[PDB]
Amino acid sequence: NLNQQRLGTVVAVLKSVNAKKVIDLGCGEGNLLSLLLKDKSFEQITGVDVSYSVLERAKDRLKIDRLPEMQRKRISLFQSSLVYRDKRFSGYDAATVIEVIEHLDENRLQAFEKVLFEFTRPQTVIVSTPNKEYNFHYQNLFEGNLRHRFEWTRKEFETWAVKVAEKYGYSVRFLQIGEIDDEFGSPTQMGVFTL
Question: Where on this chain does Mg(2+) bind (predicted)?
Answer without folding.
Answer: 26, 98
